[PDB]
Amino acid sequence: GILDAIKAIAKAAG
């Protein structure tokens, strides 16, 4: 899921 991927990445990026 594109949305799921973005969400995880966002938090990871900090």
Residue type, 13: A
| Number of residues assigned to the chain | 14
In degrees to the nearest 10, what's the CA dihedral of 8, 6, 2, 4? 30
CA dist 6 to 1, 11, 12, Å? 9, 9, 10
* 3/13 Cα distance (integer angstroms): 15
Question: Tokens standing for 13?
Answer: 């990026």
